[PDB]
RNA sequence: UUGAGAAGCUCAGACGAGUAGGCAGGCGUGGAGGUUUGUGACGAAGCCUUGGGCGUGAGCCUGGGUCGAACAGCCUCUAGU
RNA sequence: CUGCCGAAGUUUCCGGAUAGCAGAAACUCAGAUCAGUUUUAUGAGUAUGUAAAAUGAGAGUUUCUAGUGGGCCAUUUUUGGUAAGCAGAACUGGCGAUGCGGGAUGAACCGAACGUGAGGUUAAGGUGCCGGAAUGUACGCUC
RNA sequence: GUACGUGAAAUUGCUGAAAGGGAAGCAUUGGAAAUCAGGUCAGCAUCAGUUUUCGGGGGCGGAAAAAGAAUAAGGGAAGGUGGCUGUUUAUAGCCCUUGUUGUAAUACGUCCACUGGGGACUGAGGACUGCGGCUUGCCAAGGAUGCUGACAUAAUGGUUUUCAAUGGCCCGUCUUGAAACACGGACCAAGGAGUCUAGCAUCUAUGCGAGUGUUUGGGUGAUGAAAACCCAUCCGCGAAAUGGUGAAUGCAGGUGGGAACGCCCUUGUGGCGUGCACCAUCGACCGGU
């Protein structure tokens, strides 16, 4: 049993065996949708650009 | 953590360096703590469980 | 499963080349200052168990058969079931008459002979 | 195992998002948010046995 | 599935410098008992050889040459090994 | 001939024993004990000693039987010093039983510890030529 | 061919082959020449393992980059432009702040169980089991197969000599922490050093066992009779100790732990019973049991 070690990060079939979840992963997801709310306190900006 | 356990992950079973090639190996050695698969083992290590 | 040899050169005894009184047969150097015993730079090698050959192909000839010394026809019949595993090797002191009987019987059994052509021609 | 893996991955994403929102609010409020001190450490031996 | 020389077969993992010291398994030689329906003047032993092959090794087998009367494998015994 | 295990390198008492290090034999022990380790707590003087969590490893004894009882080098503390050397301890290191890469060469320097090999990648040191590898990039100094 | 069986090495002459610019031997890798055995060697494809090297796409993060561009306010000026050394955008422009275009882009960091190529090394195992994927089947899923070639009148694998590149301090002995000294070594062959015996002890084996030991001796042995076989009386050691006497009080004694076994029922565990060896315990009996 297990004559050879197969790397799941390279062997898709072995990864499917180990993880019965990789078939539904969807790594790339729109999370910064709608608009981007620039959030930077004026106090924080002043101290950042201080001295 | 995930790449280490998948690629270089080996379990100590009967004092032997047995590769983590199947979920049954982890279940037979860590099922007492409800760690049934590689992802469960990764979760325990990453989140530092009980 | 091809026949693989970990090494082809023999292990000559240290300084056996310089002196004729020192034979080529390997002798373990006992001197506590022997540079070759200490495995220094450029020194000749010493026999080690790691040099050992694969157990499956060990004792096998390049053709894949193991040599079996044969003295008369009776030994040839002993190789009836092992003709794909063993090759008959006729002994040096077996006379010409018995060689032709050994070779002919080996031909009938389909058994390879390592030196079939000796003293027989 | 699939459900556990889905839960763990969702937990990782939620924790990463939570930390980012926590930092953003403090930056907007002008306050300082310290991150959680790491519980896990990976140690690599770089010197030999001599 | 035949893979029970159970002293065998098979699976898995780790390991590999090594003095003093400790432990184990092997190679070789003279002789003895047993055995091989054993080898031999159609050539024993020995010797020689840029012939071949086997063993990690100690060593072993073999071709050719020379040679001319005896010798070997295996199991045990023994030592002026 | 091959293989396996493998020290001590010195206390403590009168050259011998005891012990230490290494094995064997025979036991009991895994709801147990250990540790060239670190925390926590107690006191006491950043350290100390005592006790009680982390991490690691199965942890214990009895018999009896080998070999060992040197030295060298270096760091730190300290004791004196002296034209200046150094001298005296302690301390654990390195060598010693140990090859290999580098330092042009080397008992003590930098790396690294060894079955036979194929491939990959590095340590230390290197990339003008000898010499494998940039007569590389950028900023200065020097005749 | 009596310088007489076999005829080793040291050593010598000859012929052949080759090497040689102040050592040589050796090791490694191949080439050449010579010589041996006698299936070999290739190319590609599709995969598996290890690995290296180029790209492409997309998330997320930070001042939710900084800039910047374009376009509206105001401010300031210069290393002062047009103008006239001095001044404030005019016949160049620049700096600062704000708005806007904005959810800008980009860089960097990070992630993708996103993706496309190039290169190298490896192919262990050997019916079927297993974990999985796609759907009885098929599969990149417990280790390489497929399709062809060429070549055997040679390629491969050797071997010998030699060359090239790289490395390589003379062996043993002794001394010391360690070297080096120093001592031994012209060369070859043959010989050449932990042996036999008595005692003691340990361990292992074998036979027998409260016994044990035939070989002083006798008997006996026709085929070698110095063997083998048989054993009367003794004797050795042991079975009794203690300094003359001379041992279950008590299942040849109870308690605890303990090998091993049995019965159970929460059944596993644990409980209960029995409890070898051995070790701590109270106990005895003889002058150790």
UniProtKB/Swiss-Prot annotation, chain A:
Species lineage: Eukaryota, Fungi, Dikarya, Ascomycota, Taphrinomycotina
Compartments, as annotated in UniProt: Cytoplasm
Quaternary structure annotation from Swiss-Prot or TrEMBL: Component of the large ribosomal subunit (LSU). Mature yeast ribosomes consist of a small (40S) and a large (60S) subunit. The 40S small subunit contains 1 molecule of ribosomal RNA (18S rRNA) and at least 33 different proteins. The large 60S subunit contains 3 rRNA molecules (25S, 5.8S and 5S rRNA) and at least 46 different proteins. uL4 is associated with the polypeptide exit tunnel. uL4 interacts with its chaperone ACL4 and the nuclear import receptor KAP104.
Described purpose of this protein according to its UniProt entry: Component of the ribosome, a large ribonucleoprotein complex responsible for the synthesis of proteins in the cell. The small ribosomal subunit (SSU) binds messenger RNAs (mRNAs) and translates the encoded message by selecting cognate aminoacyl-transfer RNA (tRNA) molecules. The large subunit (LSU) contains the ribosomal catalytic site termed the peptidyl transferase center (PTC), which catalyzes the formation of peptide bonds, thereby polymerizing the amino acids delivered by tRNAs into a polypeptide chain.
C-terminal-extended nuclear localization signal, as annotated region: 1-51
Protein name: Large ribosomal subunit protein uL4B
Organism, scientific name: Schizosaccharomyces pombe (strain 972 / ATCC 24843)
Family listed: Belongs to the universal ribosomal protein uL4 family.
Record's miscellaneous remark: There are 2 genes for uL4 in S.pombe.
Domain comment (free text): The eukaryote-specific C-terminal extension harbors a nuclear import signal and delivers the ACL4-uL4/RPL4 complex to the pre-ribosome, triggering uL4 release from ACL4 and incorporation into the 60S ribosomal subunit.
From Swiss-Prot, chain B:
Compartments it resides in: Cytoplasm; Nucleus, Nucleolus
Domain of life the protein comes from: Eukaryota
Note: There are 3 genes for uL30 in S.pombe.
Its job: Component of the ribosome, a large ribonucleoprotein complex responsible for the synthesis of proteins in the cell. The small ribosomal subunit (SSU) binds messenger RNAs (mRNAs) and translates the encoded message by selecting cognate aminoacyl-transfer RNA (tRNA) molecules. The large subunit (LSU) contains the ribosomal catalytic site termed the peptidyl transferase center (PTC), which catalyzes the formation of peptide bonds, thereby polymerizing the amino acids delivered by tRNAs into a polypeptide chain.
Subunit organization: Component of the large ribosomal subunit (LSU). Mature yeast ribosomes consist of a small (40S) and a large (60S) subunit. The 40S small subunit contains 1 molecule of ribosomal RNA (18S rRNA) and at least 33 different proteins. The large 60S subunit contains 3 rRNA molecules (25S, 5.8S and 5S rRNA) and at least 46 different proteins.
UniProt similarity note: Belongs to the universal ribosomal protein uL30 family.
Protein name: Large ribosomal subunit protein uL30B
UniProt organism field: Schizosaccharomyces pombe (strain 972 / ATCC 24843) (Fission yeast)
This protein's encoding gene: rpl702
Swiss-Prot record, chain C:
Annotated GO CC locations: cytosol; cytosolic large ribosomal subunit; nucleus; preribosome
Coiled coil region boundaries: none
Biological process, per Gene Ontology: cytoplasmic translation
KW Cytoplasm (keyword) present: yes
Signal peptide per UniProt: none
Alphabetical list of InterPro entries matching this protein: Ribosomal_eL32, Ribosomal_eL32_CS, Ribosomal_eL32_sf
Alphabetical UniProt keywords: Cytoplasm, Nucleus, Phosphoprotein, Ribonucleoprotein, Ribosomal protein
SUPFAM superfamilies: Ribosomal protein L32e (SSF52042)
Keyword Ribosomal protein attached: yes
Modified residues (Phosphoserine): 74
Subcellular location: Cytoplasm; Nucleus
Molecular function terms from GO: structural constituent of ribosome
Role: Component of the ribosome, a large ribonucleoprotein complex responsible for the synthesis of proteins in the cell. The small ribosomal subunit (SSU) binds messenger RNAs (mRNAs) and translates the encoded message by selecting cognate aminoacyl-transfer RNA (tRNA) molecules. The large subunit (LSU) contains the ribosomal catalytic site termed the peptidyl transferase center (PTC), which catalyzes the formation of peptide bonds, thereby polymerizing the amino acids delivered by tRNAs into a polypeptide chain.
Subunit structure: Component of the large ribosomal subunit (LSU). Mature yeast ribosomes consist of a small (40S) and a large (60S) subunit. The 40S small subunit contains 1 molecule of ribosomal RNA (18S rRNA) and at least 33 different proteins. The large 60S subunit contains 3 rRNA molecules (25S, 5.8S and 5S rRNA) and at least 46 different proteins.
General remark: There are 2 genes for eL32 in S.pombe.
PANTHER family assigned to the protein according to its UniProt record, in alphabetical order: 60S RIBOSOMAL PROTEIN L32 AND DNA-DIRECTED RNA POLYMERASE II, SUBUNIT N, RIBOSOMAL PROTEIN L32
Protein name per UniProt: Large ribosomal subunit protein eL32A
Organism: Schizosaccharomyces pombe (strain 972 / ATCC 24843)
The encoding gene: rpl3202
